[PDB]
Amino acid sequence: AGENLYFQSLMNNFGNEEFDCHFLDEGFTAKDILDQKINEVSSSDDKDAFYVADLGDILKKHLRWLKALPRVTPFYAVKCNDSKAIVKTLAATGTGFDCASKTEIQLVQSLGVPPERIIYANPCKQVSQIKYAANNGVQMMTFDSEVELMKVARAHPKAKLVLRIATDDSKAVCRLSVKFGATLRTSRLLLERAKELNIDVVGVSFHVGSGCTDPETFVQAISDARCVFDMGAEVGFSMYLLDIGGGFPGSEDVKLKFEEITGVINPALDKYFPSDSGVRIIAEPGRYYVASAFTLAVNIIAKKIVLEQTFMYYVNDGVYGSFNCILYDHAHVKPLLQKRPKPDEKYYSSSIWGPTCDGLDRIVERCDLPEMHVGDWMLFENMGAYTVAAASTFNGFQRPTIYYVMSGPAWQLMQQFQN
Amino acid sequence: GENLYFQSLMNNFGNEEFDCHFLDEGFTAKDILDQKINEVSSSDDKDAFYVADLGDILKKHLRWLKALPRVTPFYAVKCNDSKAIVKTLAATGTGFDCASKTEIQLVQSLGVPPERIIYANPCKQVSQIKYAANNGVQMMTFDSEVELMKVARAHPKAKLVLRIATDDSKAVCRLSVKFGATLRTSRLLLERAKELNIDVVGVSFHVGSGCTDPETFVQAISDARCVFDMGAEVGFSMYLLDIGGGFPGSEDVKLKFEEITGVINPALDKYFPSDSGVRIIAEPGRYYVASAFTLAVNIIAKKIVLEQTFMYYVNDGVYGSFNCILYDHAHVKPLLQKRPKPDEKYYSSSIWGPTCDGLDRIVERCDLPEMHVGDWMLFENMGAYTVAAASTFNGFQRPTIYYVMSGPAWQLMQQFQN
Ligand SMILES: Cc1ncc(COP(=O)(O)O)c(C=O)c1O
Ligand SMILES: Cc1ncc(COP(=O)(O)O)c(C=O)c1O
């Protein structure tokens, strides 16, 4: 009561008139807040799509990371979801940040995060953006090419470079190795070339692919990273930074859970990078931190019946907005009823469509649903990763508002981390 | 002296919203592009940028008036919602096809009366229907019984335009899977609207974006006539024919604008002669804007893969302007910005966007001379379904658009405006 208004006051300060962070009472969840917001507009037409984002879920992910990967410092991949509230939460918690560009560096530096908690993990950077990093004290960057070394020699000669190597991402949902990652053969030449140019290489990074499905690829990558460390020693570098990238799942609704992956990572780290080697192990998790924290509520705005009886439902977010993940992230979205269905009632073959002009704007091709009506809500859980970060305003449709929530214990845990 | 007059006009035209640069004495939009590149040749300030020729848009309008004299164009704002484009076409006297509240707001903010707006989204959020009603926008499209019920409640005096299905099997972007009533449904919709005291004033269709077969317009027009006859039978006084979009936006196409218009015009005269009282409109998007925009991107990074092949990374990509590759089935064509040496050697090359994603590849395979970091590549015909669907994934910002317009182009716009 007095306690609740105290926490809310502090969450209002945290929000800083940039985002709304709503205090979660004892016994109330992010799911309850979603229901409450829906009930509040029940007799209204003000039924725009919206998210509820549980900042407490993000804190739980951090705790869980600390336990599962105790030797590995997480640097959050800003690109996955660049919402300021998320970055601010993680900044207070004490994570590092993997930044892809100048604007992400600017976001992170604006929240008071020191340059040593940033890795500029884009291997192929525009020179003007390299200069920006140099001018703002961001020293650590990745690379995987000889041209990148030539650019760094000119624009950031004192940078600490991290050589990104190829992985076997053949079974990963999102493959990155076609685009980034030097082969071991190329790595050797890059090390020698860096040495000639008087550039300091301090370590190795890799990414096994977003949505990893074969955890052994982490073992192969760690083994390969050791080979490059060894080659660096031969050419004259003191290597101390191992960056194991991302690829971790962001919810429990997956075949390969986080803990299964960390269970194979840890023994490989102990074998190839024992703590008495002096190695600092980092990672660049994105999806892991944020996926389950966001739930999206969309409203059914239009409806058609196609004759057994089948239905087409149109909702107010789509493939040009949050559901761009269907195309770019190969996401398989699962529509959830906001109103619990009657135990007995008929289900029909149904399709779900976005709000735009485009026939390509289809969210679900075929599913079974009870008969729904205009004004009913549908829910999409685990919508935090590679969603709002890649949304457009095609057709003029604005991005759903994100309403943040946080419990007392979550707030307290964040303060614990912040010292 | 003439430079000072026209640039004063154009400074005020752009205001503090956009930059509109005067094209002098036989200077083209291509020349300005080259000029801007030359200005930064000694620096590292090489962000991707657009040059957009508002005079090209004005030429499209003049061309439309000549090719389809019976058809009032309502620009499809969604194709490219840049304010400068809408302001240019607004002065010209086009109508506007608005998809949502935000687009209606944009058009009304430029002084366009609601009778020059069609809300051509068949499946509209109720609150946005109410927005249109509250702001005097009467004409809206529909294709379902639930839409009629929504209109009865939220916009009872609306003038409705029944959208029908088309054979878009061969169009680049198919729309009839999502929108357009069958003939059987159309009859039921008219009967239902009569019983709900809703006024249905006409029929619309869309043959699909990137039309490949012009005869689709003929069948759609004959289908629209069938629905007009249904309407007369139930007691409506239908007058509005809306032939949608699907026209090409450049000459770099198999099926050119005049070939399509050449089959449309006889169909219109056959099925909707001027003595019928019909008013004919269309909803072109791509047609007005595609060729007007050229994108210049910089090669920001480079790899050699062993004959030698090359991978070039540029500072716009699939999450940005080149989203058109995924959403618009665009076939983009990289162009050199400097003429190569006549003998010099070409390599198999790929072109990649600036983001983390392996999916962010613009050109899988093309032949190019050996390029270097700092060199520019050009992409013409980049005005349609590009900037309008770009995101800031990885934090990369949208390229700024530099507008240009000639003196003769300004004068043309004046000639249209009164
Ligand atoms: C270099 C880099 N680091 C981190 C990530 C985040 O990966 P994930 O979200 O799968 O953890 C990515 C995303 O593709 C990446 O390319
Ligand atoms: C209803 C409607 N009108 C107009 C257009 C613009 O089409 P285009 O750019 O092919 O002329 C579209 C695009 O899909 C549309 O759906």
mmCIF file with all atom_site columns, N, CA, C and O in Angstrom, chain A residues 45 48 101 103 126 131 144 151 154 179 301 304 314 316 319 328 354 356-358 361 395-396, chain B residues 44 47 100 102 125 130 143 150 178-179 300 303 313 315 318 327 353 355 357 360 391 394-395:
data_model
loop_
_atom_site.group_PDB
_atom_site.id
_atom_site.type_symbol
_atom_site.label_atom_id
_atom_site.label_alt_id
_atom_site.label_comp_id
_atom_site.label_asym_id
_atom_site.label_entity_id
_atom_site.label_seq_id
_atom_site.pdbx_PDB_ins_code
_atom_site.Cartn_x
_atom_site.Cartn_y
_atom_site.Cartn_z
_atom_site.occupancy
_atom_site.B_iso_or_equiv
_atom_site.pdbx_formal_charge
_atom_site.auth_seq_id
_atom_site.auth_comp_id
_atom_site.auth_asym_id
_atom_site.auth_atom_id
_atom_site.pdbx_PDB_model_num
ATOM 1   N N  . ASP A 1 45  ? -13.864 1.401   -28.437 1.00 0.00 ? 45  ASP A N  1
ATOM 2   C CA . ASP A 1 45  ? -13.244 1.018   -29.707 1.00 0.00 ? 45  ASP A CA 1
ATOM 3   C C  . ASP A 1 45  ? -11.746 1.329   -29.744 1.00 0.00 ? 45  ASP A C  1
ATOM 4   O O  . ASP A 1 45  ? -11.087 1.135   -30.772 1.00 0.00 ? 45  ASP A O  1
ATOM 5   N N  . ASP A 1 48  ? -6.243  -0.719  -30.101 1.00 0.00 ? 48  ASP A N  1
ATOM 6   C CA . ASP A 1 48  ? -4.954  -0.868  -30.779 1.00 0.00 ? 48  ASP A CA 1
ATOM 7   C C  . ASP A 1 48  ? -4.167  -2.040  -30.180 1.00 0.00 ? 48  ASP A C  1
ATOM 8   O O  . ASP A 1 48  ? -4.256  -2.308  -28.974 1.00 0.00 ? 48  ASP A O  1
ATOM 9   N N  . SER A 1 101 ? 26.218  -0.766  -34.433 1.00 0.00 ? 101 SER A N  1
ATOM 10  C CA . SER A 1 101 ? 26.312  0.484   -35.179 1.00 0.00 ? 101 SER A CA 1
ATOM 11  C C  . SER A 1 101 ? 26.436  1.652   -34.224 1.00 0.00 ? 101 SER A C  1
ATOM 12  O O  . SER A 1 101 ? 26.274  1.504   -33.006 1.00 0.00 ? 101 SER A O  1
ATOM 13  N N  . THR A 1 103 ? 24.327  4.167   -33.740 1.00 0.00 ? 103 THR A N  1
ATOM 14  C CA . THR A 1 103 ? 23.130  4.509   -32.942 1.00 0.00 ? 103 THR A CA 1
ATOM 15  C C  . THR A 1 103 ? 22.967  3.630   -31.703 1.00 0.00 ? 103 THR A C  1
ATOM 16  O O  . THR A 1 103 ? 22.490  4.097   -30.674 1.00 0.00 ? 103 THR A O  1
ATOM 17  N N  . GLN A 1 126 ? 31.240  0.521   -41.441 1.00 0.00 ? 126 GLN A N  1
ATOM 18  C CA . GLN A 1 126 ? 31.478  1.738   -42.202 1.00 0.00 ? 126 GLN A CA 1
ATOM 19  C C  . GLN A 1 126 ? 32.579  2.536   -41.507 1.00 0.00 ? 126 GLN A C  1
ATOM 20  O O  . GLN A 1 126 ? 32.519  2.736   -40.298 1.00 0.00 ? 126 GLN A O  1
ATOM 21  N N  . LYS A 1 131 ? 35.333  5.400   -36.837 1.00 0.00 ? 131 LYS A N  1
ATOM 22  C CA . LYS A 1 131 ? 35.849  6.669   -36.283 1.00 0.00 ? 131 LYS A CA 1
ATOM 23  C C  . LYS A 1 131 ? 35.012  7.139   -35.107 1.00 0.00 ? 131 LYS A C  1
ATOM 24  O O  . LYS A 1 131 ? 35.551  7.592   -34.100 1.00 0.00 ? 131 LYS A O  1
ATOM 25  N N  . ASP A 1 144 ? 36.883  -9.945  -39.610 1.00 0.00 ? 144 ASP A N  1
ATOM 26  C CA . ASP A 1 144 ? 37.107  -11.256 -40.217 1.00 0.00 ? 144 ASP A CA 1
ATOM 27  C C  . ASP A 1 144 ? 37.689  -11.158 -41.626 1.00 0.00 ? 144 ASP A C  1
ATOM 28  O O  . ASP A 1 144 ? 37.566  -12.094 -42.425 1.00 0.00 ? 144 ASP A O  1
ATOM 29  N N  . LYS A 1 151 ? 41.205  -0.768  -42.879 1.00 0.00 ? 151 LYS A N  1
ATOM 30  C CA . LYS A 1 151 ? 40.310  0.266   -42.353 1.00 0.00 ? 151 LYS A CA 1
ATOM 31  C C  . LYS A 1 151 ? 40.611  0.654   -40.906 1.00 0.00 ? 151 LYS A C  1
ATOM 32  O O  . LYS A 1 151 ? 40.632  1.838   -40.570 1.00 0.00 ? 151 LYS A O  1
ATOM 33  N N  . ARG A 1 154 ? 43.776  2.712   -40.369 1.00 0.00 ? 154 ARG A N  1
ATOM 34  C CA . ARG A 1 154 ? 43.558  4.120   -40.723 1.00 0.00 ? 154 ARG A CA 1
ATOM 35  C C  . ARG A 1 154 ? 42.674  4.873   -39.723 1.00 0.00 ? 154 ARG A C  1
ATOM 36  O O  . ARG A 1 154 ? 42.977  6.016   -39.366 1.00 0.00 ? 154 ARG A O  1
ATOM 37  N N  . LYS A 1 179 ? 27.949  -15.212 -44.450 1.00 0.00 ? 179 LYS A N  1
ATOM 38  C CA . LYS A 1 179 ? 28.250  -13.780 -44.466 1.00 0.00 ? 179 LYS A CA 1
ATOM 39  C C  . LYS A 1 179 ? 29.472  -13.397 -43.614 1.00 0.00 ? 179 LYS A C  1
ATOM 40  O O  . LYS A 1 179 ? 30.236  -12.525 -44.013 1.00 0.00 ? 179 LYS A O  1
ATOM 41  N N  . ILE A 1 301 ? -9.889  -7.176  -36.121 1.00 0.00 ? 301 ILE A N  1
ATOM 42  C CA . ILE A 1 301 ? -10.493 -5.938  -36.624 1.00 0.00 ? 301 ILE A CA 1
ATOM 43  C C  . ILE A 1 301 ? -11.481 -6.163  -37.773 1.00 0.00 ? 301 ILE A C  1
ATOM 44  O O  . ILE A 1 301 ? -12.314 -5.299  -38.059 1.00 0.00 ? 301 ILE A O  1
ATOM 45  N N  . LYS A 1 304 ? -14.170 -12.612 -42.184 1.00 0.00 ? 304 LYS A N  1
ATOM 46  C CA . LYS A 1 304 ? -14.880 -13.196 -43.326 1.00 0.00 ? 304 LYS A CA 1
ATOM 47  C C  . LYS A 1 304 ? -15.166 -14.665 -43.058 1.00 0.00 ? 304 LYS A C  1
ATOM 48  O O  . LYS A 1 304 ? -14.401 -15.356 -42.376 1.00 0.00 ? 304 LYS A O  1
ATOM 49  N N  . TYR A 1 314 ? -8.715  -10.793 -39.567 1.00 0.00 ? 314 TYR A N  1
ATOM 50  C CA . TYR A 1 314 ? -7.723  -9.753  -39.818 1.00 0.00 ? 314 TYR A CA 1
ATOM 51  C C  . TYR A 1 314 ? -7.431  -9.115  -38.472 1.00 0.00 ? 314 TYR A C  1
ATOM 52  O O  . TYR A 1 314 ? -8.358  -8.806  -37.720 1.00 0.00 ? 314 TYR A O  1
ATOM 53  N N  . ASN A 1 316 ? -4.675  -6.273  -36.082 1.00 0.00 ? 316 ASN A N  1
ATOM 54  C CA . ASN A 1 316 ? -4.059  -4.956  -36.251 1.00 0.00 ? 316 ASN A CA 1
ATOM 55  C C  . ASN A 1 316 ? -2.537  -4.895  -36.011 1.00 0.00 ? 316 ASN A C  1
ATOM 56  O O  . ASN A 1 316 ? -2.002  -3.854  -35.632 1.00 0.00 ? 316 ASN A O  1
ATOM 57  N N  . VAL A 1 319 ? 2.870   -8.769  -40.806 1.00 0.00 ? 319 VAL A N  1
ATOM 58  C CA . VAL A 1 319 ? 4.222   -9.103  -41.288 1.00 0.00 ? 319 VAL A CA 1
ATOM 59  C C  . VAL A 1 319 ? 5.121   -7.882  -41.541 1.00 0.00 ? 319 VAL A C  1
ATOM 60  O O  . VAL A 1 319 ? 6.343   -7.996  -41.501 1.00 0.00 ? 319 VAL A O  1
ATOM 61  N N  . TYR A 1 328 ? 11.869  -12.822 -41.572 1.00 0.00 ? 328 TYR A N  1
ATOM 62  C CA . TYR A 1 328 ? 13.285  -12.602 -41.291 1.00 0.00 ? 328 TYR A CA 1
ATOM 63  C C  . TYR A 1 328 ? 13.870  -13.558 -40.251 1.00 0.00 ? 328 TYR A C  1
ATOM 64  O O  . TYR A 1 328 ? 15.059  -13.844 -40.281 1.00 0.00 ? 328 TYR A O  1
ATOM 65  N N  . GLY A 1 354 ? -2.675  -9.921  -41.440 1.00 0.00 ? 354 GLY A N  1
ATOM 66  C CA . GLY A 1 354 ? -2.301  -8.592  -40.957 1.00 0.00 ? 354 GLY A CA 1
ATOM 67  C C  . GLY A 1 354 ? -3.176  -7.478  -41.520 1.00 0.00 ? 354 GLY A C  1
ATOM 68  O O  . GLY A 1 354 ? -4.045  -7.727  -42.384 1.00 0.00 ? 354 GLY A O  1
ATOM 69  N N  . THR A 1 356 ? -2.511  -4.829  -43.441 1.00 0.00 ? 356 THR A N  1
ATOM 70  C CA . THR A 1 356 ? -2.145  -4.128  -44.685 1.00 0.00 ? 356 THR A CA 1
ATOM 71  C C  . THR A 1 356 ? -2.883  -4.615  -45.937 1.00 0.00 ? 356 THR A C  1
ATOM 72  O O  . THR A 1 356 ? -3.569  -5.637  -45.927 1.00 0.00 ? 356 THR A O  1
ATOM 73  N N  . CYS A 1 357 ? -2.655  -3.866  -47.016 1.00 0.00 ? 357 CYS A N  1
ATOM 74  C CA . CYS A 1 357 ? -3.155  -4.119  -48.369 1.00 0.00 ? 357 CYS A CA 1
ATOM 75  C C  . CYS A 1 357 ? -2.656  -5.435  -48.996 1.00 0.00 ? 357 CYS A C  1
ATOM 76  O O  . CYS A 1 357 ? -3.273  -5.971  -49.927 1.00 0.00 ? 357 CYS A O  1
ATOM 77  N N  . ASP A 1 358 ? -1.555  -5.956  -48.468 1.00 0.00 ? 358 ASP A N  1
ATOM 78  C CA . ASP A 1 358 ? -0.781  -6.993  -49.138 1.00 0.00 ? 358 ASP A CA 1
ATOM 79  C C  . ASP A 1 358 ? -1.265  -8.411  -48.841 1.00 0.00 ? 358 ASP A C  1
ATOM 80  O O  . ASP A 1 358 ? -1.436  -8.799  -47.689 1.00 0.00 ? 358 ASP A O  1
ATOM 81  N N  . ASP A 1 361 ? 0.791   -10.297 -46.489 1.00 0.00 ? 361 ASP A N  1
ATOM 82  C CA . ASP A 1 361 ? 0.600   -10.015 -45.071 1.00 0.00 ? 361 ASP A CA 1
ATOM 83  C C  . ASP A 1 361 ? -0.389  -10.999 -44.429 1.00 0.00 ? 361 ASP A C  1
ATOM 84  O O  . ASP A 1 361 ? -1.535  -10.663 -44.136 1.00 0.00 ? 361 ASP A O  1
ATOM 85  N N  . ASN A 1 395 ? 1.829   1.168   -44.873 1.00 0.00 ? 395 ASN A N  1
ATOM 86  C CA . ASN A 1 395 ? 0.387   1.471   -44.869 1.00 0.00 ? 395 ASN A CA 1
ATOM 87  C C  . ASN A 1 395 ? 0.017   2.514   -43.808 1.00 0.00 ? 395 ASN A C  1
ATOM 88  O O  . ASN A 1 395 ? -1.164  2.850   -43.657 1.00 0.00 ? 395 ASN A O  1
ATOM 89  N N  . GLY A 1 396 ? 1.026   3.014   -43.082 1.00 0.00 ? 396 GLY A N  1
ATOM 90  C CA . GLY A 1 396 ? 0.810   3.993   -42.015 1.00 0.00 ? 396 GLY A CA 1
ATOM 91  C C  . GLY A 1 396 ? 0.481   3.444   -40.635 1.00 0.00 ? 396 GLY A C  1
ATOM 92  O O  . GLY A 1 396 ? 0.279   4.222   -39.697 1.00 0.00 ? 396 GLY A O  1
ATOM 93  N N  . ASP B 2 44  ? 35.074  10.578  -45.289 1.00 0.00 ? 44  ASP B N  1
ATOM 94  C CA . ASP B 2 44  ? 34.477  9.292   -44.971 1.00 0.00 ? 44  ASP B CA 1
ATOM 95  C C  . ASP B 2 44  ? 32.988  9.408   -44.696 1.00 0.00 ? 44  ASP B C  1
ATOM 96  O O  . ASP B 2 44  ? 32.358  8.437   -44.273 1.00 0.00 ? 44  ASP B O  1
ATOM 97  N N  . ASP B 2 47  ? 27.311  8.020   -46.177 1.00 0.00 ? 47  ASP B N  1
ATOM 98  C CA . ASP B 2 47  ? 26.030  7.355   -45.952 1.00 0.00 ? 47  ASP B CA 1
ATOM 99  C C  . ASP B 2 47  ? 25.299  7.191   -47.278 1.00 0.00 ? 47  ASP B C  1
ATOM 100 O O  . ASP B 2 47  ? 25.408  8.036   -48.178 1.00 0.00 ? 47  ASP B O  1
ATOM 101 N N  . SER B 2 100 ? -5.095  4.065   -44.029 1.00 0.00 ? 100 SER B N  1
ATOM 102 C CA . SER B 2 100 ? -5.184  4.135   -42.566 1.00 0.00 ? 100 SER B CA 1
ATOM 103 C C  . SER B 2 100 ? -5.320  5.584   -42.095 1.00 0.00 ? 100 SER B C  1
ATOM 104 O O  . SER B 2 100 ? -5.122  6.521   -42.875 1.00 0.00 ? 100 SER B O  1
ATOM 105 N N  . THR B 2 102 ? -3.318  7.374   -40.273 1.00 0.00 ? 102 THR B N  1
ATOM 106 C CA . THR B 2 102 ? -2.087  8.146   -40.433 1.00 0.00 ? 102 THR B CA 1
ATOM 107 C C  . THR B 2 102 ? -1.963  8.725   -41.852 1.00 0.00 ? 102 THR B C  1
ATOM 108 O O  . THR B 2 102 ? -1.535  9.873   -42.031 1.00 0.00 ? 102 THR B O  1
ATOM 109 N N  . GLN B 2 125 ? -10.000 -1.146  -39.080 1.00 0.00 ? 125 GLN B N  1
ATOM 110 C CA . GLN B 2 125 ? -10.245 -1.043  -37.641 1.00 0.00 ? 125 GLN B CA 1
ATOM 111 C C  . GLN B 2 125 ? -11.379 -0.032  -37.383 1.00 0.00 ? 125 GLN B C  1
ATOM 112 O O  . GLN B 2 125 ? -11.343 1.083   -37.915 1.00 0.00 ? 125 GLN B O  1
ATOM 113 N N  . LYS B 2 130 ? -14.241 5.420   -37.616 1.00 0.00 ? 130 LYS B N  1
ATOM 114 C CA . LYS B 2 130 ? -14.757 6.581   -36.878 1.00 0.00 ? 130 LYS B CA 1
ATOM 115 C C  . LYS B 2 130 ? -13.910 7.823   -37.135 1.00 0.00 ? 130 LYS B C  1
ATOM 116 O O  . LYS B 2 130 ? -14.447 8.925   -37.310 1.00 0.00 ? 130 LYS B O  1
ATOM 117 N N  . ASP B 2 143 ? -15.597 -5.452  -48.767 1.00 0.00 ? 143 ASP B N  1
ATOM 118 C CA . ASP B 2 143 ? -15.798 -6.709  -49.501 1.00 0.00 ? 143 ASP B CA 1
ATOM 119 C C  . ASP B 2 143 ? -16.379 -7.855  -48.647 1.00 0.00 ? 143 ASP B C  1
ATOM 120 O O  . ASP B 2 143 ? -16.257 -9.017  -49.009 1.00 0.00 ? 143 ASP B O  1
ATOM 121 N N  . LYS B 2 150 ? -20.024 -3.053  -39.459 1.00 0.00 ? 150 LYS B N  1
ATOM 122 C CA . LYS B 2 150 ? -19.122 -2.053  -38.873 1.00 0.00 ? 150 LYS B CA 1
ATOM 123 C C  . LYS B 2 150 ? -19.427 -0.650  -39.366 1.00 0.00 ? 150 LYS B C  1
ATOM 124 O O  . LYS B 2 150 ? -19.447 0.296   -38.581 1.00 0.00 ? 150 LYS B O  1
ATOM 125 N N  . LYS B 2 178 ? -6.601  -12.307 -50.425 1.00 0.00 ? 178 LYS B N  1
ATOM 126 C CA . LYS B 2 178 ? -6.917  -11.551 -49.207 1.00 0.00 ? 178 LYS B CA 1
ATOM 127 C C  . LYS B 2 178 ? -8.138  -10.632 -49.359 1.00 0.00 ? 178 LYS B C  1
ATOM 128 O O  . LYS B 2 178 ? -8.881  -10.433 -48.394 1.00 0.00 ? 178 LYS B O  1
ATOM 129 N N  . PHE B 2 179 ? -8.346  -10.078 -50.556 1.00 0.00 ? 179 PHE B N  1
ATOM 130 C CA . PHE B 2 179 ? -9.411  -9.093  -50.787 1.00 0.00 ? 179 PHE B CA 1
ATOM 131 C C  . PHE B 2 179 ? -10.158 -9.323  -52.105 1.00 0.00 ? 179 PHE B C  1
ATOM 132 O O  . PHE B 2 179 ? -9.607  -9.887  -53.058 1.00 0.00 ? 179 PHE B O  1
ATOM 133 N N  . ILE B 2 300 ? 31.158  -0.369  -48.136 1.00 0.00 ? 300 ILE B N  1
ATOM 134 C CA . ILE B 2 300 ? 31.761  -0.109  -46.826 1.00 0.00 ? 300 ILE B CA 1
ATOM 135 C C  . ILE B 2 300 ? 32.744  -1.215  -46.394 1.00 0.00 ? 300 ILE B C  1
ATOM 136 O O  . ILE B 2 300 ? 33.568  -1.005  -45.514 1.00 0.00 ? 300 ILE B O  1
ATOM 137 N N  . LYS B 2 303 ? 35.480  -8.506  -49.196 1.00 0.00 ? 303 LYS B N  1
ATOM 138 C CA . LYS B 2 303 ? 36.238  -9.754  -49.048 1.00 0.00 ? 303 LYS B CA 1
ATOM 139 C C  . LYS B 2 303 ? 36.540  -10.361 -50.415 1.00 0.00 ? 303 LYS B C  1
ATOM 140 O O  . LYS B 2 303 ? 35.782  -10.168 -51.361 1.00 0.00 ? 303 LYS B O  1
ATOM 141 N N  . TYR B 2 313 ? 30.045  -5.395  -49.217 1.00 0.00 ? 313 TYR B N  1
ATOM 142 C CA . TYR B 2 313 ? 29.025  -5.001  -48.236 1.00 0.00 ? 313 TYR B CA 1
ATOM 143 C C  . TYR B 2 313 ? 28.700  -3.524  -48.441 1.00 0.00 ? 313 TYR B C  1
ATOM 144 O O  . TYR B 2 313 ? 29.607  -2.699  -48.562 1.00 0.00 ? 313 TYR B O  1
ATOM 145 N N  . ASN B 2 315 ? 25.941  0.001   -47.460 1.00 0.00 ? 315 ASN B N  1
ATOM 146 C CA . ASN B 2 315 ? 25.301  0.604   -46.289 1.00 0.00 ? 315 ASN B CA 1
ATOM 147 C C  . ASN B 2 315 ? 23.786  0.834   -46.398 1.00 0.00 ? 315 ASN B C  1
ATOM 148 O O  . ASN B 2 315 ? 23.257  1.724   -45.749 1.00 0.00 ? 315 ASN B O  1
ATOM 149 N N  . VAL B 2 318 ? 18.470  -5.384  -46.852 1.00 0.00 ? 318 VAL B N  1
ATOM 150 C CA . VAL B 2 318 ? 17.140  -6.007  -46.900 1.00 0.00 ? 318 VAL B CA 1
ATOM 151 C C  . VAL B 2 318 ? 16.208  -5.579  -45.774 1.00 0.00 ? 318 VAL B C  1
ATOM 152 O O  . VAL B 2 318 ? 14.993  -5.658  -45.919 1.00 0.00 ? 318 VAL B O  1
ATOM 153 N N  . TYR B 2 327 ? 9.448   -8.394  -49.883 1.00 0.00 ? 327 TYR B N  1
ATOM 154 C CA . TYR B 2 327 ? 8.038   -8.036  -49.854 1.00 0.00 ? 327 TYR B CA 1
ATOM 155 C C  . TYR B 2 327 ? 7.459   -7.677  -51.210 1.00 0.00 ? 327 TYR B C  1
ATOM 156 O O  . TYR B 2 327 ? 6.244   -7.741  -51.392 1.00 0.00 ? 327 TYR B O  1
ATOM 157 N N  . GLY B 2 353 ? 24.009  -6.476  -47.513 1.00 0.00 ? 353 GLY B N  1
ATOM 158 C CA . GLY B 2 353 ? 23.589  -5.351  -46.669 1.00 0.00 ? 353 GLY B CA 1
ATOM 159 C C  . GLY B 2 353 ? 24.441  -5.212  -45.416 1.00 0.00 ? 353 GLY B C  1
ATOM 160 O O  . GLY B 2 353 ? 25.269  -6.077  -45.129 1.00 0.00 ? 353 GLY B O  1
ATOM 161 N N  . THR B 2 355 ? 23.787  -5.258  -42.123 1.00 0.00 ? 355 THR B N  1
ATOM 162 C CA . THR B 2 355 ? 23.397  -5.902  -40.852 1.00 0.00 ? 355 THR B CA 1
ATOM 163 C C  . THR B 2 355 ? 24.118  -7.228  -40.561 1.00 0.00 ? 355 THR B C  1
ATOM 164 O O  . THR B 2 355 ? 24.869  -7.759  -41.394 1.00 0.00 ? 355 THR B O  1
ATOM 165 N N  . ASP B 2 357 ? 22.775  -10.108 -40.307 1.00 0.00 ? 357 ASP B N  1
ATOM 166 C CA . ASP B 2 357 ? 22.018  -11.256 -40.792 1.00 0.00 ? 357 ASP B CA 1
ATOM 167 C C  . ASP B 2 357 ? 22.538  -11.794 -42.139 1.00 0.00 ? 357 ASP B C  1
ATOM 168 O O  . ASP B 2 357 ? 22.697  -11.037 -43.102 1.00 0.00 ? 357 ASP B O  1
ATOM 169 N N  . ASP B 2 360 ? 20.575  -10.963 -45.081 1.00 0.00 ? 360 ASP B N  1
ATOM 170 C CA . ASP B 2 360 ? 20.739  -9.609  -45.612 1.00 0.00 ? 360 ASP B CA 1
ATOM 171 C C  . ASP B 2 360 ? 21.772  -9.606  -46.738 1.00 0.00 ? 360 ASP B C  1
ATOM 172 O O  . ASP B 2 360 ? 22.913  -9.162  -46.567 1.00 0.00 ? 360 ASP B O  1
ATOM 173 N N  . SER B 2 391 ? 12.989  -0.590  -42.018 1.00 0.00 ? 391 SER B N  1
ATOM 174 C CA . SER B 2 391 ? 13.131  -0.588  -40.554 1.00 0.00 ? 391 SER B CA 1
ATOM 175 C C  . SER B 2 391 ? 14.533  -0.123  -40.169 1.00 0.00 ? 391 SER B C  1
ATOM 176 O O  . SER B 2 391 ? 15.397  0.051   -41.039 1.00 0.00 ? 391 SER B O  1
ATOM 177 N N  . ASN B 2 394 ? 19.396  -3.290  -36.425 1.00 0.00 ? 394 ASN B N  1
ATOM 178 C CA . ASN B 2 394 ? 20.828  -3.045  -36.157 1.00 0.00 ? 394 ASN B CA 1
ATOM 179 C C  . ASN B 2 394 ? 21.147  -1.577  -35.870 1.00 0.00 ? 394 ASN B C  1
ATOM 180 O O  . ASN B 2 394 ? 22.313  -1.223  -35.686 1.00 0.00 ? 394 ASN B O  1
ATOM 181 N N  . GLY B 2 395 ? 20.115  -0.734  -35.838 1.00 0.00 ? 395 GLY B N  1
ATOM 182 C CA . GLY B 2 395 ? 20.288  0.696   -35.605 1.00 0.00 ? 395 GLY B CA 1
ATOM 183 C C  . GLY B 2 395 ? 20.646  1.521   -36.832 1.00 0.00 ? 395 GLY B C  1
ATOM 184 O O  . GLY B 2 395 ? 20.923  2.711   -36.720 1.00 0.00 ? 395 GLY B O  1
#
